[PDB]
Amino acid sequence: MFPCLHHSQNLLRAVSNMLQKARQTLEFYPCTSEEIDHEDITKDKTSTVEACLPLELTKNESCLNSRETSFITNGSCLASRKTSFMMALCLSSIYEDLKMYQVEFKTMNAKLLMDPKRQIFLDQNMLAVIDELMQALNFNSETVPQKSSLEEPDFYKTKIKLCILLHAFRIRAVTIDRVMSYLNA
Amino acid sequence: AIWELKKDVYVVELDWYPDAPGEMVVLTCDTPEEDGITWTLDQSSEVLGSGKTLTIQVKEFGDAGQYTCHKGGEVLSHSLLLLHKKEDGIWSTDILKDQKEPKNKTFLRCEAKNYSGRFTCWWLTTISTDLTFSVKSSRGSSDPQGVTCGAATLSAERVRGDNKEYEYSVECQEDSACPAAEESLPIEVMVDAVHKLKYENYTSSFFIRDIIKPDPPKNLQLKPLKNSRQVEVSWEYPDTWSTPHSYFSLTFCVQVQGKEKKDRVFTDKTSATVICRKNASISVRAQDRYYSSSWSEWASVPC
Amino acid sequence: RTSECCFQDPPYPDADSGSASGPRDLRCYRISSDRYECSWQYEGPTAGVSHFLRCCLSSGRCCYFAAGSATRLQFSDQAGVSVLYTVTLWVESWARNQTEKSPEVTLQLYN
Amino acid sequence: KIDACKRGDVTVKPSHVILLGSTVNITCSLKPRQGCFHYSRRNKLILYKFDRRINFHHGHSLNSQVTGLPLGTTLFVCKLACINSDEIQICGAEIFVG
Numbered sequence: 030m031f032p033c034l035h036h037s038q039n040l041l042r043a044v045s046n047m048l049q050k051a052r053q054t055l056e057f058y059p060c061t062s063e064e065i066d067h068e069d070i071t072k073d074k075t076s077t078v079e080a081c082l083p084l085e086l087t088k089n090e091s092c093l094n095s096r097e098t099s100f101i102t103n104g105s106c107l108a109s110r111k112t113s114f115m116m117a118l119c120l121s122s123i124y125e126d127l128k129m130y131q132v133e134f135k136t137m138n139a140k141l142l143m144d145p146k147r148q149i150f151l152d153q154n155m156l157a158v159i160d161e162l163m164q165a166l167n168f169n170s171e172t173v174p175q176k177s178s179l180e181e182p183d184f185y186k187t188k189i190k191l192c193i194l195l196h197a198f199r200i201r202a203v204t205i206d207r208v209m210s211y212l213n214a
Numbered sequence: 215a216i217w218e219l220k221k222d223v224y225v226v227e228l229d230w231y232p233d234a235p236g237e238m239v240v241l242t243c244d245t246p247e248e249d250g251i252t253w254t255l256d257q258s259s260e261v262l263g264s265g266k267t268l269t270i271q272v273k274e275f276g277d278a279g280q281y282t283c284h285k286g287g288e289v290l291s292h293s294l295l296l297l298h299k300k301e302d303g304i305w306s307t308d309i310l311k312d313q314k315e316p317k318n319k320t321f322l323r324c325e326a327k328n329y330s331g332r333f334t335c336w337w338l339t340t341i342s343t344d345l346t347f348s349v350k351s352s353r354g355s356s357d358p359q360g361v362t363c364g365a366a367t368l369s370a371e372r373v374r375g376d377n378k379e380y381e382y383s384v385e386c387q388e389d390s391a392c393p394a395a396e397e398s399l400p401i402e403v404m405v406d407a408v409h410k411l412k413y414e415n416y417t418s419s420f421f422i423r424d425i426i427k428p429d430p431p432k433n434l435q436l437k438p439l440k441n442s443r444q445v446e447v448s449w450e451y452p453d454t455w456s457t458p459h460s461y462f463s464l465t466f467c468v469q470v471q472g473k474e475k476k477d478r479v480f481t482d483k484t485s486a487t488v489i490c491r492k493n494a495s496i497s498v499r500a501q502d503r504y505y506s507s508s509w510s511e512w513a514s515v516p517c
Numbered sequence: 518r519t520s521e522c523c524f525q526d527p528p529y530p531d532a533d534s535g536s537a538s539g540p541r542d543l544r545c546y547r548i549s550s551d552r553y554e555c556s557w558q559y560e561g562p563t564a565g566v567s568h569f570l571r572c573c574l575s576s577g578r579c580c581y582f583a584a585g586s587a588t589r590l591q592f593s594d595q596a597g598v599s600v601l602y603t604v605t606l607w608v609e610s611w612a613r614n615q616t617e618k619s620p621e622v623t624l625q626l627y628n
Numbered sequence: 629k630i631d632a633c634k635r636g637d638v639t640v641k642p643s644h645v646i647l648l649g650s651t652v653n654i655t656c657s658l659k660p661r662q663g664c665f666h667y668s669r670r671n672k673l674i675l676y677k678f679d680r681r682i683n684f685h686h687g688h689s690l691n692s693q694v695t696g697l698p699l700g701t702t703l704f705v706c707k708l709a710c711i712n713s714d715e716i717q718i719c720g721a722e723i724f725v726g
């Protein structure tokens with residue numbers, strides 16, 4: 030049993046439940062996988078797409094581009110002398126992916142609360158799981174400050190952006206789960 | 215408009231309504247200049263036009279065919295003509311048939327069995343002869359020579375109704391050397407169906423994970439527990455499925471209904487224990503554990 | 518020549534009207550975007566009756582289809598018959614060594 | 629920057645928040661680069677309130693003046709219908725009458 034793998038399995042399950050709630054709440058807003066384009070915020074910033082691979086799959090090492098964002102932050106998920114750099118860079122990039130998403134999700138939630146009704150709001154449990162996993166991934170975890178606005182934003186745009194992020198995040202959550210399973214075995 | 219599908223082949227786009235005027239079509243020959251070039255459409259020596267240039271509006275299919283560039287008694291060049299009918303401003307779709315299983319207007323159905331990127335696409339067409347297909351593929355549009363599609367082959371000749379639909383399939387492998395954990399661009403496959411003087415094209419966009427269909431579970435065996443009614447059943451991962459088996463995982467659903475309505479049990483473990491009625495079979499199915507995928511064929515061992 | 522119209526003149530030497538019994542009710546309809554069907558009824562029956570659908574394009578290059586004891590034929594856009602412009606269609610049957618002609622009908626054929 | 633609205637942008641006059649009784653000018657505008665791939669006089673630019681058709685203009689610029697809006701939120705979504713392809717949602721506005 031791997032504790033980070035348990036957190037990652039909790040993350041994928043939490044996103045799956047939130048995604049189901051989002052489809053039910055926003056009946057008109059189009060939130061089916063077919064009608065929602067895949068857009069990834071972390072497209073160029075992080076190297077999870079390349080660094081997070083089984084050791085057998087990655088060989089030439091040429092594609093790792095000049096140790097891109099090679100922070101290699103030390104953390105409680107692995108041990109400093111336990112695994113190869115290929116997994117050390119991957120764990121740092123996964124921490125960065127969760128930081129980029131959590132900062133955005135909190136911004137969306139703060140705008141959603143202002144709605145006169147409560148049609149939809151991001152799951153507090155899902156946000157807590159993202160923070161718990163980041164704390165294990167990197168010791169120098171930064172907790173996002175409470176975000177708020179002094180004005181009211183258009184709600185339709187936030188609800189379309191929300192659906193686009195949730196689906197992309199779910200794909201990211203499976204990718205983290207596969208890496209955690211590989212680390213355990 | 216007039217565009218060249220390939221050298222010596224020119225597809226002409228024509229509107230399809232009664233009493234329609236044809237587009238002015240100009241024929242040119244890339245040969246050393248000859249005074250007196252003659253032009254034929256049919257194999258017959260009826261001569262259509264003289265000069266290195268021939269003008270003929272393609273008002274109907276009869277006016278489309280292999281115009282021949284011949285002078286001096288030697289055929290200088292060749293000018294095959296292909297037609298892309300457009301009806302009410304909508305491109306015709308007659309060569310292939312609408313399966314409709316995913317949704318309406320679906321003529322291409324693709325599938326995969328591994329994360330390697332090897333995939334096969336099946337299209338059902340009811341035209342028995344004079345049929346040719348051109349297949350090209352790429353990841354998004356950025357990858358040049360991204361995918362190496364193979365050549366169409368007839369696969370089956372079933373008798374649905376009396377039409378006898380024939381199924382043609384292509385084998386395509388992602389030729390990208392760099393391994394990547396997640397796909398950001400959908401693979402796009404284009405089939406340029408050609409029949410006689412009629413040209414049609416079909417485009418399908420998809421992701422490998424969505425089209426993946428696992429092969430049936432391997433080495434299924436039943437081992438009765440000593441002095442107990444229940445029987446332990448053990449199965450193994452398919453060799454064809456991508457490795458390592460830790461990063462890529464499958465979920466096994468076991469149904470014991472054989473021949474009470476639903477004995478299906480979903481077990482991640484490779485061995486599950488089920489009471490075996492003497493008069494039934496035990497069957498196992500495989501699906502991608504991580505994402506929703508097409509279910510595998512049932513693997514049945516007599517019990 | 519194979520399931521497609523032949524522009525060459527029909528083999529039988531004389532098309533002279535043969536007898537009171539004649540093919541009738543020749544009618545052509547569009548089964549599908551690229552499928553069509555023409556139906557004709559012969560008044561007088563024969564064991565060896567042979568049915569031919571002879572048409573003529575606007576150009577005047579009359580051509581004859583080949584059929585064997587059938588009241589119906591199905592053809593596609595490229596049989597040779599024009600499916601956008603005007604096109605006449607008529608039926609001739611050689612039974613008893615006399616060729617009778619169904620009344621000629623001109624139909625757009627796109628409907 | 630994830631963008632919810634790409635094909636086109638929709639504006640509301642004076643604002644999404646209006647006093648009970650006021651009339652909003654929902655105007656759906658399509659960017660020139662985006663549009664129906666094949667020009668045809670069959671494609672339309674519909675505007676829907678709760679998926680109910682209120683207007684339809686062939687041209688990229690669509691203008692509407694909804695009136696007598698009740699207290700609550702009304703989702704006006706402006707979809708593009710092409711000749712044979714299915715409707716693609718382009719952009720929408722949520723109006724809170726207060």
Ligand SMILES: *[C@@H]1O[C@H](CO)[C@@H](O[C@@H]2O[C@H](CO)[C@@H](O[C@@H]3O[C@H](CO)[C@@H](O)[C@H](O)[C@@H]3O)[C@H](O)[C@H]2NC(C)=O)[C@H](O)[C@H]1NC(C)=O
Nearest residue numbers: 215216217218225227298305350404405406414415416417
């Ligand atoms: C699928 O079939 C359609 C039907 O022809 C193809 O669209 C046509 O594509 C050709 C090739 O690009 C166009 O011809 C040439 O286009 C270039 C670029 O615009 C231009 O420089 C040439 O002068 C000529 O126009 C043709 O215009 C276009 N037809 C229409 C109505 O847009 C399409 O390419 C086919 N796709 C595949 C994958 O085969």
Ligand SMILES: *[C@@H]1O[C@H](CO)[C@@H](O)[C@H](O)[C@H]1NC(C)=O
Nearest residue numbers: 641642651652653691692693
């Ligand atoms: C709405 O627009 C129309 C025409 O564009 C204009 O005549 C009218 O004054 C406008 N009303 C408001 C409230 O903006």
